[PDB]
Amino acid sequence: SPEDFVYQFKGMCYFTNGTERVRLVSRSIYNREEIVRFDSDVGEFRAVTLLGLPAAEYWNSQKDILERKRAAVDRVCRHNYQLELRTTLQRRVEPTVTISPSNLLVCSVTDFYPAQIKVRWFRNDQEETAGVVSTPLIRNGDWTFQILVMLEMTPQRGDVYTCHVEHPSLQSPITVEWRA
Amino acid sequence: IVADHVASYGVNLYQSYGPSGQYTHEFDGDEQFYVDLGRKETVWCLPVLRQFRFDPQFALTNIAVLKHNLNSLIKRSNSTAATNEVPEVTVFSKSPVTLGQPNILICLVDNIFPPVVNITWLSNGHSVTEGVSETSFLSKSDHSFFKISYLTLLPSAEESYDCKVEHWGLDKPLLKHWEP
Amino acid sequence: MATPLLMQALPM
């Protein structure tokens, strides 16, 4: 097994309520150890481990570097968010909903974007939660998600099972039914 | 950190093995573009984004800085090399399988560290490369990575596949099987 | 703008 030395630099922006609240954190990472970061909430570089101490000290001592980092939340984060508003944040892809038995009923909700979604199982007129487990969101990697939501059931005569799906790409819920 | 949206502008990676680098931007965990460092060319990963311009030179400049930092840190860390993690491999279809309807097999290789990996596809025991593609290494908050490989196919009873994963954290190439 | 900006890595 050959040895590898890894370095990572991440320029991260955290957005809440549009650009009302924006937090910038740039992280310098040796192998998997974050060693220095600039957090706009703090307003200077802070070493995270001893390895990053001379970097932080050196970077903080340059007033111009500091002033540029402090302005990065507006120059970089708020600026790019304006591009996201016209593109990524408008992307809408409508989920497909399918019910299949594996007893155990599986509702597959596939090919949607964005991530915000709510899947519910009903037996007759009532929501089932006790016997329901959902996968976490599964990222397809091509800007769509899917999710599997499973229902443990003991089907009696006349039972009607409904998988109910709410998502920002739909004006109304999608409903698919299944009977034993 | 809690936020409605998270972006990396960008994820900068450089490692001694190769050596090799990678420059990407991510928005909400998906890859916006990557810069092909060897060709000095920005490659958009979402069609709507092709209307934008990102000068590859900006990424070359950042990766050059990382290369300089990595070499400073190797010595100061007393040559502390990357720890080989065990990646986790999952294989699934993009949409529900109906025979004779085109689909995509997805092989998710998660918890990758260091970011060196060989992901291949076997169709009935023999390697195939047509219809195969993959994401870049996508970042995670614990500073490991994940990568997704794809295989376009037509599901049929007579065909099964394996995702073959090679990584130093594994005793032997891990084989994940899939059938319709 | 039609131009994404980036955060610059600093040299140690």
Same domain, A72 and A105: no
Q: Determine which helix (DSSP H) or strand (DSSP E) holds A138, and give its type and residue range.
A: strand A138-139
Task: Specify whether A48 is located in the same domain as A103.
Answer: no
| 3-state DSSP percent of chain C in helix, strand and coil, to 5 | 0, 0, 100
Nearest CB among C4, C8, C11 relative to B25 is that of C4
Is B86 buried (19+), middle (13-18) or exposed (0-12) by CB count in 10 A? middle
Helix, strand, or coil (residue B74):
helix
Are A114 and A63 part of one and the same domain? no
Q: Do A102 and A83 belong to one domain? A: no
| Maximum Cα–Cα distance across chain C | 32
The range of the structural domain enclosing residue A100 comes to: 91-180
**Lookup: tokens for A53:** 């101490």
Q: B172: which residues sit within 8 A by CB, 6+ positions away?
A: none
**Ramachandran category for residue A120: left, alpha or beta (phi over 0 → left; psi -120 to 50 → alpha):** beta
Half-sphere exposure of A60 (CA within 13 A, CB side): 16
Sign of CA dihedral B178, B113, B46, A98: positive
Burial A127-146 (b: 16+ CB within 10 A, else e): ebeeebebeeebbbbbbbbb
| Contact call for B73 and A11, based on CB within 8 A | no
C-alpha A53/C-alpha A46 separation (Å) is 8
**CB B7 within 8 Å of CB B29:** no
d(CA A135, CA A76): 35
Do the Cβ atoms of A89 and A15 come closer than 8 Å?
no
* Distance in angstroms between the alpha carbons of the first and the last residue of chain C: 32
Helix (H) or strand (E) segment spanning residue A35: strand A33-39
Pair A6, B15: CB distance under 8 Å: yes
Residues A50 and A78 in one domain: yes
- Sign (positive/negative) of CA torsion B12, B13, B14, B20? negative
Q: How far apart are CA B13 and CA B33, in angstroms?
A: 14
Same domain, A104 and A83: no
Number of domains in chain A: 2
Contact yes or no for B3 and A34 at CB 8 A: no
**Alpha-carbon distances, residue B177 vs B17, B164, B165 (angstroms):** 30, 9, 11
Residue written as token pair 């032997």:
B172
> Which residues neighbour B130 within 8 Å (Cβ) at sequence distance 6 or greater?
none
Three-state secondary structure string covering B90-144:
EEEECCCCCCCCCEEEEEEEEEECCCCCEEEEEECCEEECCCEEECCCEECCCCC
Q: Which of A73, A90, A107 is the last residue of a domain?
A: A90
Domain of A77, CATH number, reads 3.10.320.10
- Note whether A113 and A79 are same-domain residues: no
User: Which of A1, A51, A84 is closest, CB to CB, to B27?
Assistant: A84
CATH code for the domain of A178 = 2.60.40.10
Would you state the structure tokens that stand for residue B29, as one six-digit string? 């965990």
Token digits of residue A103: 């007893």
In chain B, what are the helix, strand and coil shares in percent, each to the nearest 5? 15, 45, 40
Report yes or no: A59 at the C interface, CB cutoff 8 Å: yes
Whether C4 sits inside 8 A of B68 (CB atoms) is no
Full set of structural domains in chain B with CATH: 3-81 (3.10.320.10), 82-180 (2.60.40.10)
Say if the Cβ atoms of B68 and C8 lie within 8 Å: no
Nearest-CA distance A9 → chain C (Å): 7
Residues A28 and A44 reside in one and the same domain: yes
Please, which residues 150-179 of chain A have a Cβ atom closer than 8 Å to chain B? none
Domain C-terminal end among A90, A116, A140: A90
A97 and A78 assigned to the same domain: no
Alpha helices for chain A (secondary structure H): 53-61, 63-72, 79-86
Question: Do both A84 and A117 map to the same domain?
Answer: no
Helix axes A53-61 and A63-72, enclosed angle (nearest 10): 100
- Paired tokens of B174: 């891990």
- Among A150, A146, A152, A151, residue whose Cα is nearest residue A167: A146
Return the structure tokens found at A62.
Answer: 């340059």
Contacts of A58 in chain C (CB under 8 A): 12
Running DSSP on this structure, what letter comes out for residue B56? H
Question: ∠ at Cα B110 (A148, B95), nearest 5°?
Answer: 35
B62 and C9 within 8 Å at the Cβ level: the answer is: yes
Q: Which of A90, A121, A142 is the last residue of a domain?
A: A90
> Are A96 and A63 contained in the same domain?
no
Residue A70 sits in the same domain as residue A145? no
